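in:
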């Protein structure tokens, strides 16, 4: 089951995150900076199948409903974005991957002098799978993460050997909204 609660805010606006029972959490946010809230696992796995149900997905502005995680060796942040608000994240286009009923575009981005799990000022690459259209929410959904890892790997996108957290997240920037998600 899930063993990790992520609740990070850069301190802008309100992020009211509720660590609920089991794999359940909610977030109600207002006029935020950057934040990431979610439930999953202390130690991520390239093999894991993440199940979730987003009972509420109501961003007003930039929010992502996304698998979010990190590796070290090297330091990489990765995403599998299923839904969003006013902004679909993109970057350097690498290809596509089909998984769990949808097609995702694959992208890489680079962050400079940015907060990471290794410091408040670091340089790192982000790997993305971004669904081509918003995934319906409210039903039980799967993300077969092995499919994304294999697709990324085949496009020369190597994850680090040391796996950090891995969560089904609400991430926001400069936005308001409400979400309710259960992860298992
Ligand atoms: O205000 C309302 C919110 O409280 C509500 O919260 C949602 C409650 O429904 C959630 O979806 C549940 C999650 O659990 C699923 O069962 C799993 C089935 O697979 C098993 O292996 C696993 O052990 C079970 O836990 C269940 O089928 C599903 O209905 C949802 O995630 C919450 O966000 O949302 C609606 C608001 O109006
Ligand atoms: O690019 C942004 C990242 O810089 C941000 O990283 C967060 C840094 O603080 C850590 O405690 C968090 O766990 C980590 O997610 O993530 C959001 C992204 O937009
Ligand atoms: Zn490919």
């Amino acid at each position: 089951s899930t063993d990790y609660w992520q609740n990070w805010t850069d301190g802008g606006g309100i992020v009211n995150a509720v660590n609920g029972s089991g794999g359940n959490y909610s977030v109600n946010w207002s006029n935020t900076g950057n934040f990431v809230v979610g439930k999953g696992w202390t130690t991520g796995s390239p093999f894991r199948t993440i199940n979730y149900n987003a009972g509420v997905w109501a961003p007003n502005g930039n929010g992502y409903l996304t698998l979010a995680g990190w590796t070290r060796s090297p330091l990489i942040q990765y995403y599998v974005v299923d839904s969003w608000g006013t902004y679909r994240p993109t970057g350097t286009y690498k290809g596509t991957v089909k998984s769990d009923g949808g097609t995702y575009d694959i992208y890489t981005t680079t962050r400079y002098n940015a907060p990471s799990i290794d410091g408040d000022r670091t340089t790192f690459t982000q790997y993305w799978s971004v669904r081509q259209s918003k995934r319906p929410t409210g039903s039980n959904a799967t993300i077969t993460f092995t499919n994304h890892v294999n697709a990324w790997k085949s496009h020369g996108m190597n994850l680090g050997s040391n796996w950090a957290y891995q969560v089904m997240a609400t991430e926001g920037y400069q936005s308001s909204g409400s979400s309710n998600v259960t992860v298992w």
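note: DSSP finds one helix and eleven strands in the chain.
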